[PDB]
Amino acid sequence: RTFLNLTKPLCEVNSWHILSKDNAIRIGEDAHILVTREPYLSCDPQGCRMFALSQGTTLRGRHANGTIHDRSPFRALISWEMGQAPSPYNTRVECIGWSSTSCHDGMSRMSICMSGPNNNASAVVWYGGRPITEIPSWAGNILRTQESECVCHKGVCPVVMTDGPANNRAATKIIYFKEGKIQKIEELAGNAQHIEECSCYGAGGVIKCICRDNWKGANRPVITIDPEMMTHTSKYLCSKVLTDTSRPNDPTNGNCDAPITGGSPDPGVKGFAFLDGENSWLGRTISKDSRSGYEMLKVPNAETDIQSGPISNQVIVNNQNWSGYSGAFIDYWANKECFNPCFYVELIRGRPKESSVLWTSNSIVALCGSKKRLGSWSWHDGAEIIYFE
Amino acid sequence: RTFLNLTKPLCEVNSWHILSKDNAIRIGEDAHILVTREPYLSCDPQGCRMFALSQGTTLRGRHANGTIHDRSPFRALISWEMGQAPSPYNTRVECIGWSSTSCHDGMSRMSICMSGPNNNASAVVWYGGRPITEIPSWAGNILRTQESECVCHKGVCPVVMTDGPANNRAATKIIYFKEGKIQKIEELAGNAQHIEECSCYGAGGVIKCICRDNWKGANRPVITIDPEMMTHTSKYLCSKVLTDTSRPNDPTNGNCDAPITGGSPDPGVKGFAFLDGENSWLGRTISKDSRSGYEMLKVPNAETDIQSGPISNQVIVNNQNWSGYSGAFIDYWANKECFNPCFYVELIRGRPKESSVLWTSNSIVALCGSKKRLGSWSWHDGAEIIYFE
Amino acid sequence: RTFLNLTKPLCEVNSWHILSKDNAIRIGEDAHILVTREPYLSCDPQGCRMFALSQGTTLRGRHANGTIHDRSPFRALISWEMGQAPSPYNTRVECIGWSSTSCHDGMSRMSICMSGPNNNASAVVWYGGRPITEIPSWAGNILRTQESECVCHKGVCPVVMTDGPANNRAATKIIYFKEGKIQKIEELAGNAQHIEECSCYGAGGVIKCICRDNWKGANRPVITIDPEMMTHTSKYLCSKVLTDTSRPNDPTNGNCDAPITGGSPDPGVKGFAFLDGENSWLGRTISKDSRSGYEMLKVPNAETDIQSGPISNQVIVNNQNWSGYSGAFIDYWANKECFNPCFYVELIRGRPKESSVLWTSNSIVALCGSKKRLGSWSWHDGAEIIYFE
Amino acid sequence: RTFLNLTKPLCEVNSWHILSKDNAIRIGEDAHILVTREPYLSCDPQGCRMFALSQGTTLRGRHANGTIHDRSPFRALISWEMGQAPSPYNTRVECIGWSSTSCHDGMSRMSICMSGPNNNASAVVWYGGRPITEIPSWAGNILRTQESECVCHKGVCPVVMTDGPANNRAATKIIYFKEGKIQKIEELAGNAQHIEECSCYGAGGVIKCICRDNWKGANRPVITIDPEMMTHTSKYLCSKVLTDTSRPNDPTNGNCDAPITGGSPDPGVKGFAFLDGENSWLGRTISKDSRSGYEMLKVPNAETDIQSGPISNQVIVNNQNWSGYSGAFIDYWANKECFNPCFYVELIRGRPKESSVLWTSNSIVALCGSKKRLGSWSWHDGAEIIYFE
Ligand SMILES: *[C@@H]1O[C@H](CO)[C@@H](O[C@@H]2O[C@H](CO)[C@@H](O[C@@H]3O[C@H](CO[C@H]4O[C@H](CO[C@H]5O[C@H](CO)[C@@H](O)[C@H](O)[C@@H]5O)[C@@H](O)[C@H](O[C@H]5O[C@H](CO)[C@@H](O)[C@H](O)[C@@H]5O)[C@@H]4O)[C@@H](O)[C@H](O[C@H]4O[C@H](CO)[C@@H](O)[C@H](O)[C@@H]4O)[C@@H]3O)[C@H](O)[C@H]2NC(C)=O)[C@H](O)[C@H]1NC(C)=O
Ligand SMILES: *[C@@H]1O[C@H](CO)[C@@H](O[C@@H]2O[C@H](CO)[C@@H](O[C@@H]3O[C@H](CO[C@H]4O[C@H](CO[C@H]5O[C@H](CO)[C@@H](O)[C@H](O)[C@@H]5O)[C@@H](O)[C@H](O[C@H]5O[C@H](CO)[C@@H](O)[C@H](O)[C@@H]5O)[C@@H]4O)[C@@H](O)[C@H](O[C@H]4O[C@H](CO)[C@@H](O)[C@H](O)[C@@H]4O)[C@@H]3O)[C@H](O)[C@H]2NC(C)=O)[C@H](O)[C@H]1NC(C)=O
Ligand SMILES: *[C@@H]1O[C@H](CO)[C@@H](O[C@@H]2O[C@H](CO)[C@@H](O[C@@H]3O[C@H](CO[C@H]4O[C@H](CO[C@H]5O[C@H](CO)[C@@H](O)[C@H](O)[C@@H]5O)[C@@H](O)[C@H](O[C@H]5O[C@H](CO)[C@@H](O)[C@H](O)[C@@H]5O)[C@@H]4O)[C@@H](O)[C@H](O)[C@@H]3O)[C@H](O)[C@H]2NC(C)=O)[C@H](O)[C@H]1NC(C)=O
């Protein structure tokens, strides 16, 4: 039992295989399943777990009414065994709040939750199930973080947090933790103009965080982190293949160093990418307007080449079904010589796209890379909204 | 593993961070959640757990009708993983009865329940999950105890118990346990005139229990116990900031050595304080009349100065929401050179304040100290009573 | 871990303290609780568990209809953590069938279930969770066993089984198991004329089993087993305090060596006694006709003196409430120099006594000895049958 | 822990004893039980577990409507503690998909699930709870596998898989795994003309797989695997006692090297046999047309002798009750000098035979061999379909 070192390179990926699917909304039509959103997965030496923000109600409960609302005192980060649906009976409360991240350093799990009023939020940083550190809001406007896993190297786990406007310049910082205790704080530097909801992974001693610019860019920011020196750089994905939502049509040429703007009507969604030269994969919603569909695109040199475009594709969720947030995680403790990319998609059901119900929740699907050429089908949520009417 | 000793000082506390919230009434509107009251938390080397007295029914069950009643043969002390709500599926029965305390000595957990008729109640003392000792009523009138955790030092865990009237002089004893066996029994000594429902914590080799005088006093008794010498003293909180409910307006001067009378309509509520010179915090309901709201007041020298008043505050539960009991606990096994104060508030829903339902139950919120200046918002229960009509 | 040796005497018992209560019918009015009957408790080095025969349905399920029926292919011996109610989610299936026993030898648990048709039943004997031995019916008429725990000594665990009529002379055997394998089989010897449902405990190298004569006697048979020699004797309880149900009024003199007839209208009920000279306690129903109420009577020399009568009494279940089977168990792994007697009462609800519902089920209460003089109250089931109409 | 080696012979079997029964449909009438089909059991050093393919809904859920359908993105292989019913709360997700196998090699469990569209399905091979290998369809037509446990020897676990028509010649392969990695792939050889849903067990260094010829034969194919050389042969069960469903009347002689055709209206059902000279047992449905009843027949030399017929029988499920799939498993880690045959019967309820409900599910019964002559009765599902109307 030792601190995780990000020594290994990323595995070659040619297609994506199914890892897990919880069918939460289908099950929760009758069983006692908690209302969630903002899910993710995170692993540790023993296996992987699902994580999400509970709304502190079940899906069939009367309190599901009004769960489109983002921030309340009734939310918490919960975790559970991968593949089960989240019930009041099988879920571990990691921390209390309405924005989270979590990662395992090889010894113990760090979980962070922000809570409080918009003008005076605070994070509590847990390690090994105990609270270690608290961090007050520095800009007085919804202190918040990744909504997917963080990554650790030799016990140091960088976390990206933002405080400030969601629709204008904000105050992002990279906080470097060890055993839950702040080792260093950096202000965001570089050419990314706005940072939300980073999706982060490690390979060859480098952590890359692929984020949501909610202010300008339909191209995604990328923060590159050295967890040994505890330093970073930022810019945008170079590729012309735009991967936020909403977004305009892909232009001739992307831009490494500035946002590519446009699209309607929404300013962003959490997303991810794996960036490894020829071995690069970008996720995005199929729709360039709405959180519908989900596709993986193999885009060689997406990180460096403004003319890069897709050479493969795999549909994860068909464009007749609702998607949601997406994020990266890796089973860093697999018995492999390489770290194999994995990702999840949040399958949002209910408001605001399905207004015949009073609630908003999600289910989860997760996939990992394969070097083989595997066939694909759509892993949509599967619930019938009529049954909830 | 070793027996806990209380040699560490209390941590400096400048504000309170969220530790846990179970949202039990919201969840229990639809899921199978047990009806409880008299909750608390208690920790051990592995972590902290939630505790409460079940009523032996679920919240939506027909048998929730009538659960304002305090003492029945269907009640039990239950414990569960911190943050979950208490269901029939995730709860451990610690002991049977209708008044309890529990605490971990570093090796094993002691749990004590009282049961029986009013005139012939008895305690059963459990240690490591096995029954060790039984204690028959000495005064023939509802033998009872703290309703929050006890504290242990070098194997010795003092517990404060009362037997006798709730509205007149009663027979309080301090019973000193080791591995669930009585080491010594003391009658209450000193200037506290009536003792109920002590909230106790250790620091600096000293256990302080802040109690409820249900006879005359709107100021809270304080018992100070030396667990090495197995002796105690008692008096009242000196501060003019009165902390029982009901209470009169705060007077110009408190009284260290007599009850301050007044207040309407209720004789008392379980509460707590942390008393550490300048580093002193008093909890109380916001209402001076009713169990609504909850505030933390930093009252330097509350223990010693009749003129001591607040220098800061933090609303825990707004005064538009119901509160209930509150009590002290500490994670004495944290990785810290000091013991950090924690507390909970019982958020009572249903009767008698909400008589549109037939039941009485509660949810839990718990917070711990921070040296930082954290923002705050109200952590009220969050259930809509209309949904239960 | 080591094999249990019955090296200690019984503890002195002056009164009985509450050990556990599951409130299963109150909870199972709304939560998913299995229909059961024939419960017991059994301990091991880690603590004690509850056991019962499930009916393979929940209480509120439609399949609860008709659960007065004793023997179906849907029944199983389930065990669960002491104090919880038995749900589909917290119960361990020990074995399949409609009559059982179970005991822990200090290394692993042996469980035995009988199943099959009346004329062709069979036992399966499990050890450490694996099936070891099978035993075919020898008399072609409902091969069956204790319905409470067995007892082990130096790895030898005797079990009493009957096969044959319930209303005439039957073929009872004592089978001595070690690690689930048969060591020896004895035909019943001595003066007991009919044996059902033995309740057994150990002390001082002797196992005593207090049974139900369903044929003739209102006095209970007593089998005395030597688990080292693997031999036994039998007779009846001597006391004039008759403890089966139904029974006649207590005569002025018992009978050590023949059944005392009389009683209407029930031929018997499972019960128990602790027999230890002056330290002897007899349980029975308060009603002499019906499974109503439950009392403990201290009857010095009940085992040897036909004139022995009660010197003290404790009501366990008042005679306005339903009782049921009762049986013995001991926490042989307690940290005491003596083995402390415990018992349980099955609190039967529904048919036949409560015919306004379609089901028959039970809850459990359990108590253990105290040397103190504890007060008592009634530990009845607590469910309101009207809520199930 | 060490790799399992198939060193032991089969145990003599003269009758079958009950091992487990989950009563899932009875319980699931009211409790939250997943819809399933294609169940099995599989053991490991600690005991045995139940397995099945969930439909990603509860039985009383609205999503149970349409669960006759075989292949959806909402299915998964789930496992749970033997004898419990499968709920969302007690089931482990082994892998995602709509065809499976699993087996333990003595060190860890391998589980394999196929998912995807009919023309582009893929297997994912898990070991120790982590994905190891992926296998794309080779024939573009529902890559699929055993639907009961595989068997391992010295770390090598062969698995039979088919891809191609269900009603014509298909491409079957035997894939030999070690630690979830492919050691060798063989095309099916020998005289079996069509292979589906193999039921496999090991004894004396040989693995025997008794399968389903869904194209022609009402006699069952038998694949014999040498797990050290990683080679096999195939033919049919010799015996005139035909054991697929549907089937014609048993002919005067069977045929070891070609299918015996006929029967109406269905082309096959998954089944099993244990083949060990005299000590040979064949399962089959009692009906020759429908999945009704289930019987075990002792058919000496069924593997070699075309004139072999039954010398004994045991009814497992009477012919007034629905059966379903059946399969082999063995507790290879029992404390016996032989490996004792076990099997399960899938008890299918709902569509198509019970059209008054919208769903299809099942419960499980499992039995193992006994050398004794045990009595038997019918272990039918036991649910009342009227309660679901
Ligand atoms: C970001 O978050 C942080 C932390 O969550 C937060 O920090 C707080 O900042 C405020 C100032 O903005 C601090 O407030 C101070 O509180 C001091 C003590 O207040 C309590 O006690 C008062 C005295 O009570 C006694 O006597 C009265 C009158 O006779 C009697 O009613 C009482 O029963 C008792 O006997 C009391 O009046 C006061 O009441 C307020 O709060 C209660 C709930 O507790 C509420 O019910 C009341 O309605 C009322 O709101 C309170 O209970 C106080 O002495 C201090 O006042 C001095 O300084 C101010 C300048 O700020 C002067 O105006 C004043 O003259 C005083 O000399 C001041 O009010 C608070 O302590 C901080 N808390 C912490 C934990 O740091 C920030 O506000 C947040 N930022 C944003 C933008 O939200
Ligand atoms: C605090 O709680 C404790 C714990 O429960 C409690 O302590 C008990 O105190 C009472 C006295 O208050 C003690 O009662 C004694 O019991 C003796 C034995 O009684 C049993 O047997 C009697 C005879 O039974 C046989 O004979 C009759 C024919 O005579 C026949 O019907 C029977 O079938 C049988 O053959 C029997 O009469 C008696 O019945 C009582 O109790 C049963 C429940 O078991 C109930 O259903 C009946 O309605 C009835 O109440 C019982 O079954 C008894 O010998 C003894 O009598 C002497 O003492 C009293 C004074 O106490 C004298 O008045 C009398 O003349 C005798 O000299 C007495 O009844 C009991 O043993 C204590 N138990 C323990 C565990 O200590 C405290 O009272 C509680 N305090 C408060 C304030 O509530
Ligand atoms: C077994 O399943 C396999 C796994 O899914 C499958 O293998 C797949 O085979 C298909 C057909 O051969 C291959 O498709 C090839 O894909 C590349 C990549 O195409 C993607 O990118 C292009 C270009 O996008 C950009 O420019 C367009 C054009 O101007 C803009 O609109 C856009 O915004 C971008 O700037 C895009 O046009 C493609 O569009 C397809 O896919 C999406 C979903 O991702 C649909 O929404 C869309 O309508 C259309 O169907 C696509 O996004 C392409 O260049 C080649 O020409 C070819 O199309 C897959 O790559 C291959 N996948 C893998 C993982 O191997 C097998 O086909 C399947 N077998 C069977 C029998 O079903």
Ligand SMILES: *[C@@H]1O[C@H](CO)[C@@H](O[C@@H]2O[C@H](CO)[C@@H](O[C@@H]3O[C@H](CO[C@H]4O[C@H](CO[C@H]5O[C@H](CO)[C@@H](O)[C@H](O)[C@@H]5O)[C@@H](O)[C@H](O[C@H]5O[C@H](CO)[C@@H](O)[C@H](O)[C@@H]5O)[C@@H]4O)[C@@H](O)[C@H](O)[C@@H]3O)[C@H](O)[C@H]2NC(C)=O)[C@H](O)[C@H]1NC(C)=O
């Ligand atoms: C305690 O329970 C014991 C456990 O069950 C039980 O012991 C059983 O005792 C019975 C009665 O002695 C024995 O029966 C014997 O069985 C053999 C084999 O019978 C099976 O095979 C024959 C031949 O089948 C083939 O040919 C026929 C006709 O041409 C075809 O129809 C069939 O397809 C085959 O091609 C078959 O006729 C038998 O049919 C019976 O059983 C089936 C269920 O399997 C029913 O559907 C059917 O109606 C009929 O009842 C059977 O399948 C036979 O050859 C002997 O002559 C004799 O019948 C059991 O073998 C024996 N079992 C064991 C495991 O020991 C005890 O009886 C019981 N005690 C009490 C008191 O109940």
Ligand SMILES: *[C@@H]1O[C@H](CO)[C@@H](O[C@@H]2O[C@H](CO)[C@@H](O)[C@H](O)[C@H]2NC(C)=O)[C@H](O)[C@H]1NC(C)=O
């Ligand atoms: C869902 O929640 C909304 C918001 O609380 C409920 O709408 C309120 O209903 C109350 C009681 O009738 C009104 O007095 C409020 O003014 C309404 N508020 C708003 C914002 O509309 C609605 O009733 C709930 N629906 C259900 C079915 O519970």
Ligand SMILES: *[C@@H]1O[C@H](CO)[C@@H](O[C@@H]2O[C@H](CO)[C@@H](O)[C@H](O)[C@H]2NC(C)=O)[C@H](O)[C@H]1NC(C)=O
């Ligand atoms: C809640 O509990 C009360 C008390 O048992 C019930 O009130 C009784 O109702 C019974 C049955 O109709 C009447 O005979 C009595 O008049 C009532 N007793 C008292 C003290 O009021 C009430 O019915 C229960 N309510 C529900 C909905 O279960």
Ligand SMILES: *[C@@H]1O[C@H](CO)[C@@H](O[C@@H]2O[C@H](CO)[C@@H](O)[C@H](O)[C@H]2NC(C)=O)[C@H](O)[C@H]1NC(C)=O
């Ligand atoms: C069960 O599932 C079927 C299939 O989805 C449902 O049938 C549909 O019902 C809707 C609403 O009545 C109709 O618009 C469609 O025409 C039907 N579709 C088909 C394919 O038949 C059926 O309603 C469901 N039944 C229940 C009780 O949920």
Ligand SMILES: CCC(CC)O[C@@H]1C=C(C(=O)O)C[C@H](N)[C@H]1NC(C)=O
């Ligand atoms: C507050 C800004 C932030 C990022 C743009 O909004 C997020 C957008 C969300 C969204 O676009 O769906 C939902 C998130 N729950 C919300 N985060 C919080 C903490 O409320």
Ligand SMILES: CCC(CC)O[C@@H]1C=C(C(=O)O)C[C@H](N)[C@H]1NC(C)=O
């Ligand atoms: C019996 C006196 C005691 C302290 C005043 O009453 C308490 C008051 C209560 C209260 O004020 O809410 C509830 C407690 N459940 C009750 N305790 C018992 C054991 O019934």
Ligand SMILES: CCC(CC)O[C@@H]1C=C(C(=O)O)C[C@H](N)[C@H]1NC(C)=O
């Ligand atoms: C079959 C005789 C036996 C003992 C008299 O009957 C018992 C009586 C019972 C009873 O008196 O309540 C219930 C038991 N479940 C039953 N046992 C079985 C195996 O059916």
Ligand SMILES: CCC(CC)O[C@@H]1C=C(C(=O)O)C[C@H](N)[C@H]1NC(C)=O
């Ligand atoms: C696809 C052919 C295959 C074997 C003949 O059909 C099976 C028949 C079934 C059956 O006969 O009941 C149900 C199985 N779930 C199905 N398998 C799959 C993967 O769909």
Ligand SMILES: *[C@@H]1O[C@H](CO)[C@@H](O)[C@H](O)[C@H]1NC(C)=O
């Ligand atoms: C108290 O516990 C601490 C930490 O285990 C230990 O170092 C110290 O010696 C203890 N003091 C006493 C007097 O037991």
Ligand SMILES: [Ca+2]
């Ligand atoms: Ca954007």
Ligand SMILES: [Ca+2]
């Ligand atoms: Ca008071």
Ligand SMILES: [Ca+2]
């Ligand atoms: Ca009798």
Ligand SMILES: [Ca+2]
């Ligand atoms: Ca066939």
